[PDB]
Amino acid sequence: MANKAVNDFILAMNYDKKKLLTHQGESIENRFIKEGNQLPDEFVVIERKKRSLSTNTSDISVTATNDSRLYPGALLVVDETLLENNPTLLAVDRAPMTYSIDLPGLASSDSFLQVEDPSNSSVRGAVNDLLAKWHQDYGQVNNVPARMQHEKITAHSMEQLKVKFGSDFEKIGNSLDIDFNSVHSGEKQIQIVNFKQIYYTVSVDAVKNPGDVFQDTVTVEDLRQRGISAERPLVYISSVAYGRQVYLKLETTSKSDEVEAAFESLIKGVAPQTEWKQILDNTEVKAVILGGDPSSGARVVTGKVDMVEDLIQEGSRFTADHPGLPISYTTSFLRDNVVATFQNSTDYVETKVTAYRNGDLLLDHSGAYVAQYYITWDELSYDHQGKEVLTPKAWDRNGQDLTAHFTTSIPLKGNVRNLSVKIRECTGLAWEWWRTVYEKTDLPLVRKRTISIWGTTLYPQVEDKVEND
């Protein structure tokens, strides 16, 4: 008999489940460069470092909208196309199969769905008609909330993002306009956030015998004609989660330590602190929304930080006006019901940034004496190794005799280090010609420092005024 042979064919298969489901991303040699770059208002120090990301997961994120391959109980072939989340469907004559839907407020009597010929349209139709009946005795009367999961990552490379969010993420990533060259060059920090909102799940019970998914007319010949063997075995979709999904790009020009907490308060809808409000106002937002709204189709929006409140709560309620579309699914090996787990890894270059604000040094001389200034500092940069170089600098008027009223502003960029200022005045006394008015080394590079000198040859005075908000 055909079905017994098919049954025995599947049971006879031995394969390495781990090796079949492992994929290796791009290989980058180990590196570390420390680079300086001067922006208009700040000096940015950039550290690059080769890093690796690896994930082992059974949940497969859905980027498509109306994928007819991704129905509960669908048979998929285990090959490279499955690892790339673009699977080959085995669409042979299917036996009936019993499903269970999991949905708030439902006695396990209407939980089960018997579909005679499993396909996307037939499973779809069976679930949507049960839902239609669920709308009129629970959907509206009882308030039925969606189940929210969210995950985040700092964006560094698209290969990295694919390892985090799934192998077909670029369908999503291309629509977010992610500026990887700006994070690398050090003038942007980007976080990608994914919000899932699960309305309901449709699961398949364990398949007792592998032959139980095929009609009696399906032969070993038919399966081998479609390339099925121990080399390309079968899985079945054992569960599908339905709801709304949001991919959120947060891109800022700030170089702050507080960006994570700033973005986190917004994911949370928390009142922003003063250091974050700077960052949030310099944040751009792009979003891909995968339907919790009629119809099944991707919406790619851009906006302000203020949008994120609305994008998370829009389809947070499943009154089942419109059924959600697939947002993830899990597969299990037909042979033995072992859940298929996918191992993905990649190397990527991590960029971490540190900013140093530019500052001004102001001098006021209102004293009744000749003063001389000796202002020196080092300019920081990095050689092509990433090692520190300190080139010494000096104010062009150092040691010159200056008289009141003298004022000037010396612009000091963020790369200035070891700022030392010494001021002396000519007392006119043969026995004590010069007197030191001010002498400080390693002055903090505040936004604005005003060193004012006044008084007389005998009683000079000084003020060191800082403004650094």
Residue numbers in the entry: 1 to 469
Sentences from the study reporting this entry:
In addition to the extensive cellular damage resulting from pore forming activity on host cell membranes, Ply modulates host inflammatory and immune responses. Particularly noteworthy is the presence of a non-hemolytic variant (Ply-NH; encoded by allele 5) in serotype 1 ST306, one of the most successful pneumococcal clonal clusters. Ply-NH differs from wild type hemolytic Ply (Ply-H) by the presence of 4 substitutions (Y150H, T172I, K224R, A265S) and 2 deletions (ΔV270 and ΔK271).
To decipher the molecular reasons behind loss of pore forming ability in Ply-NH, the crystal structure was solved (2.2 Å resolution) and was found to consist of 4 distinct domains, D1-D4. This is the first reported structure of a non-pore forming CDC. Monomers in the Ply-NH crystal were found to be tightly packed and this crystallographic arrangement resembles the monomer-monomer interaction interface that may form during formation of the pre-pore complex. On the contrary, I172 in Ply-NH is found to be stabilized through the hydrophobic interactions involving the side chains of F169, L176, Y247, V288 and L290. The interactions from Y247, V288 and L290 might be essential to prevent the disengagement of these α helices joining β3 and β4, to form TMHs for membrane insertion and subsequent pore formation. This clearly implicates Y150H and T172I as the major mutations responsible for the loss of pore forming ability of Ply-NH, by preventing disengagement of α helices joining β3 and β4 and subsequent TMH formation.
